[PDB]
Design a protein around this nucleic acid. Structure first.
Ligand SMILES: [Mg+2]
Ligand SMILES: [Mg+2]
Ligand SMILES: [Mg+2]
Ligand SMILES: [Mg+2]
Ligand SMILES: [Mg+2]
Ligand SMILES: [Mg+2]
Ligand SMILES: [Mg+2]
Ligand SMILES: [Mg+2]
Ligand SMILES: [Mg+2]
Ligand SMILES: [Mg+2]
Ligand SMILES: [Mg+2]
Ligand SMILES: [Mg+2]
Ligand SMILES: [Mg+2]
Ligand SMILES: [Mg+2]
Ligand SMILES: [Mg+2]
Ligand SMILES: [Mg+2]
Ligand SMILES: [Mg+2]
Ligand SMILES: [Mg+2]
Ligand SMILES: [Mg+2]
Ligand SMILES: [Mg+2]
Ligand SMILES: [Mg+2]
Ligand SMILES: [Mg+2]
Ligand SMILES: [Mg+2]
Ligand SMILES: [Mg+2]
Ligand SMILES: [Mg+2]
Ligand SMILES: [Mg+2]
Ligand SMILES: [Mg+2]
Ligand SMILES: [Mg+2]
Ligand SMILES: [Mg+2]
Ligand SMILES: [Mg+2]
Lengths: 81, 25, 118, 66, 181
RNA sequence: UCGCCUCCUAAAAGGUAACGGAGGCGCCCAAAGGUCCCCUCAGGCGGGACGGAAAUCCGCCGGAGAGCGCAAGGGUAGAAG
RNA sequence: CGCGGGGUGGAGCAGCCCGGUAGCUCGUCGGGCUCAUAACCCGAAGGUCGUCGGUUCAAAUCCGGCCCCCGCAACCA
RNA sequence: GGCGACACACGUGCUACAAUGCCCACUACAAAGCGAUGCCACCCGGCAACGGGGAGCUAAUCGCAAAAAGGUGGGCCCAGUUCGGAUUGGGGUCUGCAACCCGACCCCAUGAAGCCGGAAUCGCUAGUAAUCGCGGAUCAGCCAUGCCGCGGUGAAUACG
């Protein structure tokens, strides 16, 4: 919660804002899980890092206010014995 | 009680202020 | 009498018996009490159907209650799930969804204990 | 209809959220109805008051201006 | 009383909209609405046949008819049920009395249902009659809510001389039945 | 194993044997009896709150596969149900 | 082959007779007391009743086949 | 990224299960500490957190500050409740490069377990035990119910 804010990292922000106005779209690996997502992100395929590797996450219109690490979970589970 | 943040008694305990403990003297 | 679907409050006191409705209590009550110019201190047992229908009309129109309210919080969470979202997963597995160490008691959210061997 | 052991069913008067029904014709004449979902409130003569679908709708508005 | 608003409303603007719409040559072929059967499967009261006379009293109140008491057909163990015992009340209305109830139902009961985004559109039985289940009985006007000890619903069967659902839906829409489309 | 009942063996009347093949009886019903009146199943698909393979309800199709206190056989809704 | 008995939580017994509800001791699991283990105390989990088929509304329970188990008998030759 | 995992098990705690009690309004009485890279009166906007402005103080000299219980007055009428506030939904404030994982706080909705706890087990001999608030260290902020301290009201009971 920020408001005068909406923090996104400038590093991918570049490569995304490009893939509108370049005209072309493809797979982009970023470490920034602190950033928020959209509008010009939607439909882009972004690889987010969980600490281990880069997870493909497809993007849509109800992912909007959600930070990029929501969709890249950090812990491996599958329950118990 | 001291854990109702929506009460006077609660607020005092958590140490905070608000609509249920507005700051005036 | 009856408001917001059925939900009949009775006797007691009118600002209190207003809490017994889904979506309402404390604030949202003592507000619509003067907004309809009704004495809160009175008892829902007796009052003019006048102050009764003014009272249902406000409430049932103002905000969403009961069915549609629960239907909204439903689909809100359905939205968090199936979007693959983190919080969604914590709903999917019925585990605590904000902060909250789960090594020890989550119990309210986790269910009662299911013990196993050492 | 066998005489005896039967509700009376006499012409009545009935009211509601808006108007009456002169129709009535029921046992226990003069009854008080909560709301007819058709006074055309509540989904009929569709009011659609306090509408839904704001949650995908809002996160896009306060979002990229700030 | 042979007047009954909705009855009138059927001849005096439902029938014509129907002939106009399906193009009926014969006066009879245009669908007539016969026999709505209200039935409480009440097997709730099974050992207590005392509970039942309260429930039958309540059906009468909202119908104008005391219901027949159904009885068990075959004995079946999985839930109790001796071969003889009463399952529930079942009452047939027609002819005026069905209309005077069907009116009250349309303008009062179904409105008083919590939520209610409308009657199910698929419940037509394919030879074109319509059934619909209800849960609580205090959504009727004739019920005082302090006379309910417990909550027993009912299945409602509406039979029509329509040969198909397409025609049966039309008759029922035009009568004012709030379908969920 | 020993008397009684049903089916087969039994060779299309009856009868017909074996330590031949298979099952039942030693009761029950004051309604499960007499009569007059009425009613018609099982099952299948569709529809219906709690109702689930199945409680009850509504539609259509269903010549008997149901029922007839208990074993089998014959019989039987134009009733014996 | 013959006649009798049995087969049920991990172990050992009950329940079957008289249809509708599975019980008892040990063991196992969680806690307690002890420096600690045992003893001891407070809690719990655990069986589809050998198997297939049949009767009834309903089968651990009544019936029939088979698969094991123990006992008995197998004489005059 | 993890140390924050969660089928579970134990230790120390906090908030309770209410009427010697809960809520609201008014009315009082402390000590010890901290702060001009800070403590911020007072005024305005805001339901509020907070944000604008902005005076004093190197501080027995200004600020944190309201102490709380108590007191008075009215409300609740034994009810899983005006008890209890865990959980979750939505809306926001702030620190910080940054609050998905992991922050604290405010409002709106949600209101769970719980009706004094099996076997067992702890502390305390007086201004103590109970109970009520307050300050500091660490520190951007904070998961502090912790720790170290300060005063308020204030029992019972020791045959042996
Ligand atoms: Mg409270
Ligand atoms: Mg937390
Ligand atoms: Mg955690
Ligand atoms: Mg259909
Ligand atoms: Mg038809
Ligand atoms: Mg012959
Ligand atoms: Mg011959
Ligand atoms: Mg014999
Ligand atoms: Mg007779
Ligand atoms: Mg049938
Ligand atoms: Mg069916
Ligand atoms: Mg036959
Ligand atoms: Mg026979
Ligand atoms: Mg025959
Ligand atoms: Mg034995
Ligand atoms: Mg042990
Ligand atoms: Mg030991
Ligand atoms: Mg056997
Ligand atoms: Mg069986
Ligand atoms: Mg049994
Ligand atoms: Mg000899
Ligand atoms: Mg740690
Ligand atoms: Mg330990
Ligand atoms: Mg603690
Ligand atoms: Mg409880
Ligand atoms: Mg986090
Ligand atoms: Mg109590
Ligand atoms: Mg305790
Ligand atoms: Mg001492
Ligand atoms: Mg403190």
């Amino acid at each position: 919660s920020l408001k005068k804010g909406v923090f996104v990292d400038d590093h991918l922000l570049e490569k995304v804002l490009e893939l509108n106005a370049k005209g072309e779209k493809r797979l982009i690996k970023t470490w920034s899980r602190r950033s928020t997502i959209v509008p010009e992100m939607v439909g882009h395929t972004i690889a987010v890092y969980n600490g281990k590797q880069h997870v493909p996450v497809y993007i849509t219109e109800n992912m909007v206010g959600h930070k990029l690490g929501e969709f890249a979970p950090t812990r491996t589970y599958r329950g118990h014995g | 009680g001291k854990g109702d943040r929506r009460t006077r008694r609660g607020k005092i305990w958590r140490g905070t202020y608000g609509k249920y403990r507005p700051r005036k003297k | 009498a009856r408001i917001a679907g059925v939900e009949i409050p009775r006797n007691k006191r009118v600002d209190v018996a207003l809490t017994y409705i889904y979506g309402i209590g404390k604030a949202r009550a003592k507000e619509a009490l003067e907004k309809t110019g009704i004495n809160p201190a009175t008892r829902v047992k007796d009052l003019t159907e006048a102050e009764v229908v003014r009272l249902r009309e406000y409430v049932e129109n103002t905000w969403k209650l009961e069915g549609e309210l629960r239907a909204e919080v439903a689909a809100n969470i359905k939205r968090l799930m199936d979007i693959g979202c983190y919080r969604g997963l914590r709903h999917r597995r019925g585990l605590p969804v904000r902060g909250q160490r789960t090594r020890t008691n989550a119990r309210t959210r986790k269910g009662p204990r299911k013990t196993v061997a050492a | 209809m066998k005489e005896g052991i039967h509700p009376k069913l006499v012409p009545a008067r009935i009211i509601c959220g808006c108007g009456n029904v002169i129709e009535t014709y029921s046992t226990k004449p003069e009854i008080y109805v909560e709301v007819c979902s058709k006074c055309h409130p509540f989904y009929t003569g569709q009011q659609r008051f306090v509408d839904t679908e704001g949650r995908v709708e809002r996160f896009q508005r306060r979002y990229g201006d700030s | 009383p042979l007047d009954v608003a909705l009855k009138r409303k059927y001849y005096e603007e439902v029938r014509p909209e129907l002939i106009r719409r399906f193009g009926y040559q014969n006066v009879w072929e245009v669908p007539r609405l016969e026999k709505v059967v209200i039935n409480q499967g009440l097997g709730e009261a099974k050992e207590d046949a005392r509970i039942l006379e309260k429930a039958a009293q309540e059906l009468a109140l909202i119908t104008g008819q005391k219901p027949a008491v159904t009885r068990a057909k075959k004995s079946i163990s999985n839930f109790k049920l001796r071969k003889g015992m009463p399952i529930g009340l079942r009452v047939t209305l027609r002819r005026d009395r069905m209309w005077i109830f069907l009116e009250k139902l349309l303008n009062v009961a179904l409105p008083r249902i919590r939520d209610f985004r409308g009657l199910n559109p698929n419940s037509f039985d394919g030879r074109g009659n319509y059934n619909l289940g209800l849960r609580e009985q205090l959504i009727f006007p004739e019920i005082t809510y302090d006379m309910v000890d417990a909550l027993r619903g009912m299945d409602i069967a509406v039979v029509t001389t329509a040969e198909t659902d397409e025609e049966a839906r039309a008759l029922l829409e035009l009568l004012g039945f709030p379908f969920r489309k």
